[PDB]
C-alpha cells in the first residue's frame, strides 16, 4: 500500500513520471530486492525519485546513510552525487547489503560508498569525539531503529554542517499515527510507534532546525540545519 | 480532504509539523483568503513549509510567481527567500493580492515583490527576445490558470537557470485518473483534468527536466532544468 488515498493514484504517479527514465540499476536492484523475504523495508521508488532530485538541488558531495539493506537508498544516491562523491553507509547486517552490490557496481558507482557493518550510535558517538568531522556532512538519511532516532538525532545534528538537510524515514508510519484506539495492528508497528510520535514532536520542537514532512513513500521528515 | 489516506494524518501532518512552527501570519493571510467571497477553491496549509524549505535549500535569490490570489504561496516564498534578492511575483488578472497585500505588507516583506497584472504569457515572449533574460531565475512558480502551464513551460524553461526549478500546482488535480467514463465528477473538474493529465504526460517527457510530482496539499510538479 501507501500514504496517499488509492493504490490507483500512487501508482499513476510512478506510471507516469517515476518509472519512465529510472537508470535501470533501481529497475534491477528492485528486482534483486523483491525475492528477499523483508522486501517491505525497501525504500519506494518515488521516494528513490524524491531523494535524487534532493540531493541534486543542494549539490550534496559527502553524505551518510544510516540503514542500508540491499542498497536502494544508497544506490539512489550514488547515482545522484557527483564522480567525487562519498557516503558513508551503515548497516548491522550486511548480507543484505551484499545482495545489491552487485548491482551498484554493474553502475560503476560503488566506488563512491564506505560500507561499514554495524550498530550506527557506536560509530556515531566515534565522530563526535575529533572536532573535524563537525558540520563535514551535507546529507545524511536515516532509515534505520526508529527506536534511536532521537539518540541519532542528538549527534547527527553536530555532524550535519549549517548548509543542513538530515531526512527521517517513515514518520507518518504507515499512518499509524492516527490510528483508532481499538483497531490492532501488528506487534511491531504498535511498538515503534511509541516512538515515532516521541520523535515528531521532539522535531517541531527543535530551535537548531527548520523540518518538512513529505508524505511520500512513509513520509520523510527533511531536517535543514540552521545552527 | 487532501489526498492522503485519512483527513486525520493529513491534519497529523498539520497539527505536529505546521501549525507549530508555522510562519507569522500564514495563519492570518490563510484566515483572510477564508473571508473572501468566492471561496473557489483550495488553501493548503502544507505548501508553505514546503515551499520555505525548497527555497532555503535551492538557495533561491531572483524568483518569479505566475498565478497570484491573495497571495499565499507568495507570502511564503517572498519571507522563505532573503531580504537581498527580489520576488518577480509576475501577476493574476484578478486584484485578490490586493486582499491580501495588507498581511504581506504587515510581515515587512513586500518591499521584494514586483507585482504586475493581466496576462504574463505576454510579458514571457517579451522577456525572451532578449538574449540575457534567458537563464536568470533561479526558481518560478506555476499556480496560472491551467490551460497555459505547457504554453507557460514554453517560454518558462527558457528563463531559469541551471536547476532553476519551476513548480506547477495543482498537478494532481484532487484526483485526476478516477474510475472511468463512469465517475460522478463535476464538469468543472473533468474539464480541467483533461489539460492536467496532458500536463503531466508533457512534462514527464520533456528531457530538458527531471520532474518530481509530490503529494503536497493538491500536488505540485517540480522540474529541475537538466539543458
Ligand atoms: C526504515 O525502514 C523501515 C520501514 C518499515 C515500514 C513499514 C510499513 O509498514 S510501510 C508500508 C509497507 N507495506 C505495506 O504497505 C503494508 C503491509 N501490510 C498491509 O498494508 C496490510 O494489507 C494489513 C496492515 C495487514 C491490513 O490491515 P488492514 O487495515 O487491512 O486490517 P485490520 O487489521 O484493520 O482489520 C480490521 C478488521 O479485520 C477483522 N479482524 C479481526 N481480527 C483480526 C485479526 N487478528 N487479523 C486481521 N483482521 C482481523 C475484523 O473484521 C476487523 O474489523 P473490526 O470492525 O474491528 O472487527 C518498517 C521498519 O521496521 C523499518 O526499519
Ligand atoms: N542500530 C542499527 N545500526 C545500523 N543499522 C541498523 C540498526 N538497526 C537496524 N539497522 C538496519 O537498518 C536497515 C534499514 S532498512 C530501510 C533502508 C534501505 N536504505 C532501503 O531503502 O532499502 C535494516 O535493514 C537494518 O539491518
Ligand atoms: N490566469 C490566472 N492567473 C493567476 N491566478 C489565476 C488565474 N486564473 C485563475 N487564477 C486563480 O488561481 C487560483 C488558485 S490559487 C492556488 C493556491 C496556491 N497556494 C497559490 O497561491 O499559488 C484560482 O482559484 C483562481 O481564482
Ligand atoms: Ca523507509
Ligand atoms: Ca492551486
Redesign the pocket.
Known amino acids: 500500500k501507501s500514504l496517499l488515498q488509492s493504490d490507483a493514484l500512487y501508482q499513476y504517479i510512478l506510471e507516469t513520471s517515476v518509472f519512465p527514465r529510472e537508470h535501470e540499476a533501481m529497475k534491477e536492484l528492485r528486482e534483486v530486492?523483491a525475492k528477499h523475504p523483508?522486501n517491505i523495508?525497501?525504500?519506494s521508488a518515488d521516494?528513490?525519485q524524491f531523494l535524487s532530485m534532493l540531493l541534486k538541488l543542494i549539490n550534496a558531495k559527502n553524505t551518510m546513510?544510516?540503514?542500508?539493506?540491499?542498497?536502494?537508498?544508497?544506490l539512489?544516491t550514488a547515482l545522484a552525487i557527483p564522480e567525487d562523491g562519498k557516503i558513508l553507509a551503515?548497516?548491522?547486517?550486511?548480507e543484505?547489503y551484499e545482495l545489491g552490490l552487485p548491482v551498484i557496481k554493474k553502475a560503476g558507482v560503488d566506488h563512491k560508498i564506505d560500507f561499514r557493518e554495524?550498530?550506527?550510535?557506536p560509530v556515531l558517538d566515534e565522530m563526535i569525539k575529533d572536532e573535524k568531522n563537525h558540520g563535514s556532512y551535507d546529507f545524511i538519511?536515516v532509515?534505520?531503529?526508529k527506536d534511536?532516532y532521537l539518540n541519532y538525532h542528538k549527534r547527527l545534528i553536530d555532524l550535519v554542517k549549517v548548509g543542513g538537510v538530515i531526512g527521517y524515514?517513515?514518520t507518518l508510519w504507515n499512518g499509524s499515527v492516527v490510528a483508532p484506539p481499538d483497531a490492532p495492528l501488528r506487534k511491531y508497528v504498535r511498538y515503534y510507534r511509541d516512538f515515532v510520535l516521541e520523535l515528531n514532536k521532539a522535531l517541531a520542537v527543535d530551535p537548531r532546525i527548520e523540518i518538512c514532512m513529505l508524505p511520500v513513500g512513509d513520509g520523510i521528515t527533511i531536517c535543514r540545519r540552521i545552527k
Chains 1, 2 share one sequence.
Open positions: 530486492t523483508w523495508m525497501t525504500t521516494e528513490g546513510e544510516i540503514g542500508v539493506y540491499t542498497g536502494y537508498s544508497l539512489a551503515m548497516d548491522i547486517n550486511k543484505n554495524g550498530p550506527a550510535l538519511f532509515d534505520a531503529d534511536n524515514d517513515n
